Design a protein around this ligand. Structure first.
Ligand SMILES: Nc1nc2c(ncn2[C@@H]2O[C@H](COP(=O)(O)OP(=O)(O)OP(=O)(O)O)[C@@H](O)[C@H]2O)c(=O)[nH]1
Ligand SMILES: Nc1nc2c(ncn2[C@@H]2O[C@H](COP(=O)(O)OP(=O)(O)O)[C@@H](O)[C@H]2O)c(=O)[nH]1
Ligand SMILES: [Mg+2]
Lengths: 16, 129, 426, 123, 438
């Protein structure tokens, strides 16, 4: 799991 | 687009401001603003005749001067508050956080003679309803 | 949470404070029917300091209003903010003062002191935490020196350890309305020095000079004189009512400027003063306020301060301002006028700073100063006394009221003693 | 000077009524208003009942030019600003005009000509 | 577990603390509402939030300090201020009246009507602390609730916790600029109830910080908020090891083993280093050399006292940031050449360095920029004597004409005390002149 910041960081850097 | 710290001179409304750096109190505060700063091939330069508007300008060659010429939660108050709350010394009902809370919202058997022979609880049912 | 009490006596004292009670009523935003309509919130946590609460939101002025003759109370209740005053606090007799100190102090006064102390200690005991006893009166009158001197004598013997400041109106040198002014002044000055341990007294002439030169009004009535002397007394207590970063409360504004226990005669003043037509042409800047605070013309000066030397000075400020300027500039006032501030005291000026500006301005200040030049304010009354006592002009009225001549000279001997320590520090 | 001589002893006696029922504690108050036409100053007196709980003082508002809206473009009240059927804002207090002296009626007939004068008394 | 009780007492202290817990919270990612940032992260470890906070059961971490000022004005601005629903409802003891700037109202009258609860709370807090490392006091040195209440505690405290470090953060009177007129009195009277009850005196001025706000940070006309946050950061820089990881780590105990030499000589003047704006910042090379060949310069000392007409003795060089251990050695090596940073003959060593690894934090909306390093040269020099000589000389010049002594020995005291202070002070001076003596 991750916090509600790594999920945001991953959808505007690596396009998840 | 701020003023550099070494800059002396005049910037408007600097005298009434305080507590901020010279690049922030200037950047927070005219259309033509330039202070901050945000044919030639058909004639050879030896020519000595006349072309209009060609006796005026520098910053560029003669062969270029004929170019330019042509072109409600969180309402409570916590313990021991030595301020004044309206309706604090008057009313009551709960704790000082709730006292300061409620004070802010308010800022803005008959006929028993003729009962004979029927049960007393059943008598009060007739009196109540 | 820390409350103040204001006292009104005399015709002059009643009219000043009635103009003073409206200045804070629209400073704290209290409507002149009794309710409250303030803009911000910060003027509600300290509303008990100078007022107090009643049922229905109908806020109450905490003041006592006393005079022998009920003529001026008929005007206060008829005024703009006179429907807030509590008629329990309206204690009055039936006869006039007569502009003399005999029918104000010992005989007429003695049958009202019980009636007035009963309502003063009514509110003083219902107070959560008393702080001070402000009083506004006129020295050259029959009631201000008459009964405004009993109360300050009968409060101090009952509250011996509380600060209390007074707002006297000393008679002017060359313009006067009565011809009995030094009789009502010298006999007060001995008593005023003995127990007030703080005064605030500037004549009527200096109020005329400020309204003619600093403010430039052609026809100044008593209104703007009372407004201006009310402005210098709404900023003296501003640290008790508004927050700040470096503030001065009243007892804090007492030991900082009373160097000797009977050396307590001060000199008020209001900083942001300008003409009616020169508002937009003037930079309301704190280096320029204090050039105007430290003169004789735009500051409330009954006597010229350059004729003496400043012994200890206050400067309470109001409004959002920088502390570095006011620290460096009081340093600049000190060294430029080192010949007019005393030696043997390294720091001379208090720097008090508030957080919230007054109504109508963005910064303000109030000049409060002990000057040795105030000795000339008492020379002229003494010079007037010995020019009229030596003929025994009006000693028969005082003799007729059962009052002796033996301590009639004890008042002058002590104000001659009083000024002697003033002249010790030339 | 020209207004002092023209309307020296011409006083406009305007009977009035004030109610405070929005407050928790209050009574229906009846007021008397005098308007000097010499210098346009409004003076308000108070008349009390036979056993009123209020102290019997003389005046309610002193001899002054009364401001237009609330507590203070310094616009003030004038004679044409108020009439019968309108409410005046006397220092944040809503006071309705009910009756007038007959001399003021004769004053109003000569200048504009208001007729039939439907007075609205309270009880 | 290395908790640290910081007692801020007074108008000043409360201010130099309402702007100290801000960064004491910012660094350890603490939300201005207890529950910490609960949606992201900031990297601090569920341990660094203990040096100055106390985890409850819902994250409502609470400040480990005590703010006591008689008048309620200031602490009321905290009760109703940006920082609330966090400061303990009782860690903010509210008094009644003020102090007038007369020591007495802090060491005789009202001064006593509150120490019963104030001392109580500081102990009530000691319970949770399983290692109170010291008592950092934050008050003025020229007021009433600053010298009074503090003095009372200072001694009172020692007679209950004793064995401990009493480092103090004070706003000493400035040479020329000054507010209250009886400052040279309420000050000479507190250097007699601290010189034998408090250890290191991290003393700070007002004129000096003001000149630095213009000569370096370029803020003509600064205020107290501008001054408090800088003094506030000196505090954080000192209490760095107790919370942040690093190489050489200096502790509150070590801050008084390589610092104060002889018992009484404990007057260190502090010196933050990367005091710079943002315009002249991302341009200059903040080098461990410059950030050091500046903390030893005269115009950068926060206590007006030429650091050249005297003799340094001990000098901690706390180094928060990306300071590799090497540069530090050479930096101090340069300092030892400069034939001007004169030294005495008793301290051949001299500098204690703490290269902690945690770059400074920027208080949202401030002059300080995002520098990646900082020094705090807290040093004991013998020129802090020219900071007393003045206050002292003044006392006499004024006491001569027994000025402002009535309302002093009146609320409770003893005229004699005045005289005794002057004596104790003459000694402090006598010893300083005999300490720097070869
Ligand atoms: N750096 C800084 N110094 C301050 C601040 N406020 C006050 N001071 C200093 O404190 C000195 C006066 O002492 P205070 O702490 O303000 O007064 P006090 O201890 O509360 O005593 P009283 O004023 O009688 O209540 C002044 O000379 C100022 O230099 C501040 O916000 N920041
Ligand atoms: N500045 C000022 N002075 C006033 C006012 N009313 C009265 N005085 C002064 O008071 C003096 C006389 O009033 P006084 O005899 O003291 O009133 P009394 O004490 O009630 O008899 C006059 O010389 C006036 O100068 C006022 O509103 N403002
Ligand atoms: Mg204080």
């Amino acid at each position: 799991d991750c916090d509600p910041f790594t999920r945001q960081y991953y959808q505007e850097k690596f396009g998840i | 687009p701020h003023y550099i710290p070494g800059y002396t001179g005049h910037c408007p409304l600097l005298r009434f401001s305080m507590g901020q750096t010279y690049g922030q109190m200037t950047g927070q505060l005219p259309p033509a603003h330039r202070t901050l700063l945000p044919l030639s091939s058909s004639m050879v330069p030896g020519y000595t005749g006349f072309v209009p508007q060609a006796q005026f300008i520098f910053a560029k060659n003669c062969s270029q001067v004929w170019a330019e010429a042509l072109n409600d939660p969180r309402k409570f108050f916590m313990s021991g508050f030595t301020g004044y709350v309206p309706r604090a010394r008057f009313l009551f009902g709960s704790s000082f956080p709730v006292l300061s809370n409620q004070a802010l919202q308010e800022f803005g058997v008959p006929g028993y003679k003729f009962q004979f022979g029927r049960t007393y609880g059943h008598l009060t049912q007739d009196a109540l309803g | 949470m820390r409350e103040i009490v204001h006292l009104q006596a005399g015709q002059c004292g009643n009219q000043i404070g009635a103009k003073f009670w409206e200045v804070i009523s629209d400073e704290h935003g209290i409507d002149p029917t009794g309710t409250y309509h303030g803009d911000s919130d910060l003027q509600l946590e300290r509303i008990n300091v100078y007022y107090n609460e009643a049922t229905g939101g109908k806020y109450v002025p905490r003041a006592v209003l006393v005079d022998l003759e009920p003529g001026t109370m008929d005007s206060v209740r008829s005024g703009p903010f006179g429907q807030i005053f509590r008629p329990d606090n309206f204690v009055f007799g039936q006869s006039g003062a007569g502009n003399n100190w005999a029918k104000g102090h010992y005989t007429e006064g003695a049958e009202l002191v019980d009636s007035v102390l009963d309502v003063v200690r009514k509110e003083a005991e219902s107070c959560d935490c008393l702080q001070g006893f402000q009083l506004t009166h006129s020295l050259g009158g029959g009631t201000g020196s008459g009964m405004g001197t009993l109360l300050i004598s009968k409060i101090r013997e009952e509250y011996p350890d509380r600060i209390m400041n007074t707002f006297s109106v000393v008679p002017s040198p060359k313009v006067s309305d009565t011809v009995v002014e030094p009789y009502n002044a010298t006999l007060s000055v001995h008593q005023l020095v003995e127990n007030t341990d703080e005064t605030y007294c500037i004549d009527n002439e200096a109020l005329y000079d400020i309204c003619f030169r600093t403010l430039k009004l052609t026809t100044p009535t008593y209104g703007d004189l009372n407004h201006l002397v009310s402005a210098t007394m709404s900023g003296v207590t501003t640290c008790l009512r508004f927050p700040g970063q470096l503030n001065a409360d009243l007892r804090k504004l007492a030991v900082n400027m009373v160097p000797f226990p009977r050396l307590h005669f001060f000199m008020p003043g209001f900083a942001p003063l300008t003409s009616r037509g020169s508002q937009q042409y003037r930079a309301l800047t704190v280096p320029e306020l204090t050039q105007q605070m430290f003169d004789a013309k735009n500051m409330m000066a009954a006597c010229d301060p350059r004729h003496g030397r400043y012994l200890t000075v206050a400067a309470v400020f109001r409004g959002r301002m920088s502390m570095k300027e006011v620290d460096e500039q009081m340093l600049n006032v000190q060294n430029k006028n080192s010949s007019y501030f005393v030696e043997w005291i390294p720091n001379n000026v208090k720097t008090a700073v508030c957080d919230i500006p007054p109504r109508g301005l963005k910064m303000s200040a109030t000049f409060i100063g002990n000057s040795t030049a105030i000795q000339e304010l008492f020379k002229r009354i003494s010079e007037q006394f010995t020019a009229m006592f030596r003929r025994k002009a009006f000693l028969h009225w005082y003799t007729g009221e059962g009052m002796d001549e033996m301590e009639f000279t004890e008042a002058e001997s002590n104000m001659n003693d009083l000024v002697s320590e003033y002249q010790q520090y030339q | 000077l020209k207004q002092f001589l023209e309307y020296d002893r011409k006083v406009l006696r305007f009977f009035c009524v004030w109610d405070d029922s929005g407050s928790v504690f209050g009574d229906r108050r009846e007021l008397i208003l005098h308007y000097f036409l010499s210098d346009d100053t409004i003076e308000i007196k108070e008349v009390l009942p036979h056993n009123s709980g209020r102290d019997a003082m003389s005046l309610f508002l002193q001899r002054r030019k009364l401001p237009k809206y609330g507590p203070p473009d310094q616009e003030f009240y004038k004679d044409t600003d108020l009439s019968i059927g309108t409410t005046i804002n006397v220092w944040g207090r809503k006071v309705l005009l009910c009756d007038c002296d007959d001399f003021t009626k004769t004053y109003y007939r000569t200048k504009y000509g208001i007729e039939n004068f439907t007075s609205i008394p309270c009880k | 577990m290395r908790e640290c009780i910081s007692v801020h007492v007074g108008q000043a202290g409360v201010q130099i603390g309402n702007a100290c817990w801000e960064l004491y919270c910012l660094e350890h990612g603490i939300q201005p509402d207890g529950q910490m940032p609960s949606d992201k992260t900031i990297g601090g470890g569920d341990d660094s939030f203990n040096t100055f906070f106390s985890e409850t059961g819902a994250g409502k971490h609470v400040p480990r300090a005590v703010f006591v000022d008689l008048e309620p004005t200031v602490i009321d601005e905290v009760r109703t201020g940006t920082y609330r629903q966090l400061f303990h409802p009782e860690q903010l003891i509210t008094g009644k009246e003020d102090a007038a700037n007369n020591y007495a109202r802090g060491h005789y009258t009202i001064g006593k009507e509150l120490i019963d609860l104030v001392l109580d709370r500081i102990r009530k807090l000691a319970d949770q602390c399983t290692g109170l490392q010291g008592f950092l006091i934050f008050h003025s040195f020229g007021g009433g609730t600053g010298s009074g209440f503090t003095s009372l505690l200072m001694e009172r405290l020692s007679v209950d916790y004793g064995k401990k470090s009493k480092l103090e953060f004070s706003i000493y009177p400035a040479p020329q600029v000054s507010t209250a007129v009886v400052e040279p009195y309420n000050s000479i009277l507190t250097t007699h109830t601290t010189l034998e009850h408090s250890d290191c005196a991290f003393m700070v001025d007002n004129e000096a910080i003001y000149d630095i706000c213009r000569r370096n940070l370029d803020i003509e006309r600064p205020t107290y908020t501008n001054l408090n946050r800088l003094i506030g950061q000196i505090v954080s820089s000192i209490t760095a090891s107790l919370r942040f990881d690093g190489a050489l780590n200096v502790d509150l105990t070590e801050f008084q083993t390589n610092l104060v030499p002889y018992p009484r000589i404990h007057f260190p003047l502090a010196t933050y280093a990367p005091v710079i704006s943002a315009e002249k910042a991302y341009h200059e090379q903040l080098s461990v050399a410059e950030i050091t060949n500046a903390c030893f310069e005269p115009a950068n000392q926060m206590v007006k006292c030429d650091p050249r007409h005297g003799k340094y003795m001990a000098c901690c060089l706390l180094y928060r940031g990306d300071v590799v251990p090497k540069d530090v050695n050479a930096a101090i090596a340069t300092i030892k050449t400069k034939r001007t940073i004169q030294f005495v003959d008793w301290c051949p060593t001299g500098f204690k360095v703490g290269i902690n690894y945690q770059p400074p934090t920027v208080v949202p909306g401030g002059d300080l920029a995002k520098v990646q390093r900082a020094v705090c040269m807290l040093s004991n020099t013998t020129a802090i004597a020219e900071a007393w000589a003045r206050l002292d000389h003044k006392f006499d010049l004024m006491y001569a004409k027994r000025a402002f002594v009535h309302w002093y020995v009146g609320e409770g005291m003893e005229e004699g005390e005045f005289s005794e202070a002057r004596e104790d002070m003459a000694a402090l001076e006598k010893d300083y002149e005999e300490v720097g003596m070869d």
